[PDB]
């Protein structure tokens, strides 16, 4: 109830999108993103730094990569107060590969200052998927291979080539013996794309198994652009071996590193009784790419080559796509990384909303070399098109951190799930679903520690598109489970003011901490669609018992601040002092305008009304029938003490305030039984400027002698009104009396 509205400080700059993301830095600065500003061609979005002292904003240096094209930098922001950091993401980088474009994300982890170029997240963009595949075969032609099985191996190759030629595939084959035998190149397959025509006339070589040199000639002679291999294609080699290298002058130490520098992915089919021993199977693991379990399988005889070719088709398809078919389920591509961002203590996190056909997912770059990707357990069509990670927030469970996620489109109903880690394994602790279809439940998330325990007591879930007649949004009060394994259950619900059905209450949420000095954390909720998109911000106090008050305390409409404001409350950021006045400030974002609201110190008034002649003494009821006037002394003491309900780093010696006394005697009766010294009626009004020390004033009452017989005691009521004088420094900031302050005081004087 104590946010200064009249002396608000508004920032403005001509850049499309300025106000669409705000974040309070520690050092008296507000960082705002302008995601739609065209600073240069093939770049979009910029960032600005707004200081409280210098009322203008300054641009931020942009170390944008060349293929971070049309980035929309500044759509998502996050910062940490205790280590000075800034996480700025543009989640719309366009990679226009041949025949497809992709939308991805890129972030920047600034530090204490801004000319130091930050840590890029991710350091490497995921990149263009390679186009078309060059598949080579290397088949054993030792004398160990019996002639009937040799034709089984040829039929294996022919059927797999028939199965793998979906479109635009080139194939090659080289037998391998004592000497090595190029039967057909990729170019020769392109001119005659009949696998059986190329494979059937081949005759079996005989002799010693020179596996290592055969791998070398595949890399050199067979994977060569003069023989039809295509640049930037997938290079796959399938080696079919009896698995016992004999007589080869080269070891595996030589040809395998040169196979890896050319990027040749190696599959091994190990055939026969040779690999019933584990030692021979480890030699198969040496040939193939890592991990061996995916790339190595063992068949007991060449007739069992038919068994692996069913699964090997799926395993080789997996590089292009796993169980994809048509209408491919795009995974870690189309992701839009950093769509929602947050900085975990371990490392910066950033959400991939477009992961697994927009089912949603969250990256966790704790060291950036390991990426901890986190979506949910069930893999089904139900989870598709959920946009999970659209609001990402962290909770504190005894100062150990966990994660909460928002999927506003789970079967066109919102969904919010919690995650915690178990010895490096991030599992879904619980989930909460919405009920209003299209309410966008979970578009905004906000974790609230009411008592500042270090234990998050409450997660605020916003459903800004919930339509309930006059109401135009909803915020769900969802406390964290204590640990009785009860499913996560939302105890209460917060609405906005009635009258704006398209008001979007709950589109942006923040924690501003304690503003009124009640030791309980207060929250703000923005409604940037109210009053026909001239938005508003509501303030809700915390409650003892770790809840949020169902009725708001202060509604700040964007119409009253400036006539040319729009979407007031689309971006919120609180919890830090920006004016160095010890007052918890609060920044609000709007279209084209960003404005900060300063918190006013709260005062409370204590009234003590004490009479030394509180005794009735009843002398007056013996009047000697003379002319009756108010007689006898009237000692009165009226002390008022005003104290601070808020702690600030002000000096606190300059807290002046003006209070107005109104006094009434025997109110509620037609004529009173008492009058004052001066007015000669039953009314008194005094004004007096008061500090924070008790100022006490003695008065004189007058009692007429013979009155009605003593039944009712005399009362002295006091109503008052406090206007704090603004401070000479600190931008004329006015102390305000508490909303729940008692403003009536009755005194007792018996009859």
């Amino acid at each position: 109830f104590n946010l200064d509205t009249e002396n608000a400080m508004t920032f403005q700059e001509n850049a499309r999108g300025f106000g669409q993301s705000v974040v309070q830095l520690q050092g008296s600065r507000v960082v705002v993103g302008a995601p739609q500003e065209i600073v240069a061609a093939n770049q979009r979005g910029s960032l600005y730094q707004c200081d409280y002292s210098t009322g203008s904003c300054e641009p931020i240096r942009l170390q944008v990569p060349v293929e971070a094209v049309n980035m929309s930098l500044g759509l998502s922001l996050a910062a940490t107060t205790s280590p000075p950091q800034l996480l700025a993401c543009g989640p719309t980088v366009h990679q226009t590969c041949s025949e497809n474009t992709y939308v991805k994300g890129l972030c920047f982890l600034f530090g204490s200052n801004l000319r130091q170029q930050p840590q890029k997240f991710p350091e490497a963009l995921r990149g263009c998927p390679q186009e078309d595949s060059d598949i080579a075969f290397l088949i054993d032609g030792s004398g160990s291979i019996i002639p009937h099985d040799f034709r089984r191996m040829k039929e294996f190759v022919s059927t797999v080539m028939e199965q793998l030629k979906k479109s635009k595939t080139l194939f090659s084959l080289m037998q391998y013996s004592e000497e090595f035998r190029i039967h057909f190149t990729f170019k020769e397959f392109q001119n005659n794309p009949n696998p059986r025509s190329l494979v059937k006339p081949i005759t079996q070589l005989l002799g010693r198994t020179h596996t290592a040199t055969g791998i070398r000639k595949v890399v050199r002679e067979l994977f060569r652009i003069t023989n039809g291999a295509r640049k930037n294609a997938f290079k796959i080699l399938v080696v079919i071996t009896d698995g016992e290298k004999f007589g080869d002058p080269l070891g595996y130490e030589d040809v395998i590193p040169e196979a890896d520098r050319e990027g040749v992915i190696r599959y091994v089919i190990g055939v026969g009784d040779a690999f019933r021993s584990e030692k021979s199977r480890q030699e198969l693991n040496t040939i193939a790419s890592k991990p061996p379990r995916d790339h190595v399988f063992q068949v007991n005889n060449f007739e069992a080559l038919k068994t692996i070719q069913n699964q090997l088709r799926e395993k080789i398809f997996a590089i292009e796509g796993t169980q994809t078919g048509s209408s491919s389920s795009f995974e870690h591509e189309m992701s839009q990384e950093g769509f929602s961002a947050a900085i975990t203590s371990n490392g910066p996190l950033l959400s991939t909303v477009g992961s697994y056909d927009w089912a949603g997912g969250v990256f966790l770059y704790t060291s950036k070399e390991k990426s901890t990707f986190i979506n949910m357990t069930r893999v089904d069509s139900d989870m598709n098109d959920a946009y999970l990670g659209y609001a990402a927030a962290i909770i504190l469970r005894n100062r150990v951190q966990s994660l909460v996620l928002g999927a506003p489109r789970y079967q066109h109903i919102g969904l919010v799930a919690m995650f915690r880690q178990n010895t490096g394994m991030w599992e879904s602790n619980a989930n909460v679903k919405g009920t209003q279809i299209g309410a966008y439940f979970g578009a905004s998330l906000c974790s609230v520690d009411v008592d500042s325990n270090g234990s998050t007591d409450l997660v605020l879930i916003g459903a800004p598109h919930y339509y309930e007649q006059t109401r135009g949004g909803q915020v769900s009060v969802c406390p964290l489970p204590r640990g009785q394994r009860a499913r996560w259950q939302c105890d209460a619900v917060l609405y906005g003011e009635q009258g704006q059905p398209w008001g979007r209450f709950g589109a942006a949420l923040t924690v501003l901490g304690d503003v009124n000095g009640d030791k309980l954390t207060d929250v703000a909720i923005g409604a940037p669609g109210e009053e026909d998109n001239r938005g508003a911000v509501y303030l809700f106090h915390g409650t003892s018992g770790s809840g949020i008050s169902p009725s708001h305390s202060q509604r700040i409409a964007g119409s009253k601040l400036s006539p040319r404001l729009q979407y007031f409350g689309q971006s919120l950021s609180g919890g830090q002092d920006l004016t160095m006045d010890g007052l918890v400030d609060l920044t609000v974002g709007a279209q084209g305008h960003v404005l900060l609201l300063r918190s006013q110190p709260v005062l409370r008034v204590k009234a003590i009304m004490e009479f030394n002649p509180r005794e009735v003494a009843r002398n007056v009821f013996e009047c000697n029938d003379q002319v009756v006037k108010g007689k006898e002394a009237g000692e009165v003491r009226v002390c008022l003490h005003v104290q601070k309900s808020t702690r600030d780093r002000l000096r606190e010696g300059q807290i002046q305030s003006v209070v107005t006394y109104d006094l009434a005697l025997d109110s509620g009766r037609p004529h009173s039984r008492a009058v004052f010294n001066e007015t000669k009626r039953s009314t008194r009004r005094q004004t007096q400027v008061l500090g924070l020390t008790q100022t006490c004033e003695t008065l004189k009452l007058q009692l007429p002698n013979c009155i009605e017989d003593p039944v009712s005691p005399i009362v002295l009521r006091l109503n008052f009104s406090l206007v704090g004088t603004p401070l000479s420094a600190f931008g004329n900031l006015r102390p305000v009396l508490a909303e729940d302050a008692q403003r009536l005081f009755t005194a007792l004087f018996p009859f």
């Epitope: 000497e179 079996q204 005989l206």
Partner: nanobody, 121 residues
Framework: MQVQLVETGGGLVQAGGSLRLSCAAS????????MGWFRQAPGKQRELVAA???????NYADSVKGRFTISRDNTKGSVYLQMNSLKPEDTAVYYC??????????????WGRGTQVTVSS
């Protein structure tokens, strides 16, 4: 598999002279690997005097070492026998042979019909 062998180069040659034998294989180069030359002198059986693998490893009989050279051109499907310092004891019908497999001493199923080389004293 169908492979046909034809010998080209035989004839009459003086002692101390030289002669080159050649042969093309009528079929798929993928359908045969090892090639060799035999000779059959009068009264005698077919003697392997020079054989070559597909990659060019050679073996020679001791009676022709230092005088005969076997060579091949896989781009033409051909193998050659350059016979230098010819002697009357080299008079024979010379055959070319080819194998489906790549061994120098095994399964010489494909045979040419042979060509006569007669060396006069």
């Amino acid at each position: 598999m169908q492979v046909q062998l034809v010998e080209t180069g035989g004839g009459l040659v003086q002692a101390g002279g030289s002669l080159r034998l050649s042969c093309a294989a009528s079929g798929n180069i993928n359908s045969f690997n090892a090639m060799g030359w035999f000779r059959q002198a009068p009264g005698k059986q077919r003697e392997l005097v020079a054989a070559i693998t597909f990659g060019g490893r050679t073996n020679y009989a001791d009676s022709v070492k230092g005088r005969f050279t076997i060579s091949r051109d896989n781009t033409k499907g051909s193998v050659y026998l350059q016979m230098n310092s010819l002697k009357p004891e080299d008079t024979a019908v010379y055959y070319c042979a080819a194998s489906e497999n790549n061994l120098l001493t095994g399964v010489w199923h494909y045979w040419g019909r042979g060509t006569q080389v007669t060396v006069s004293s």
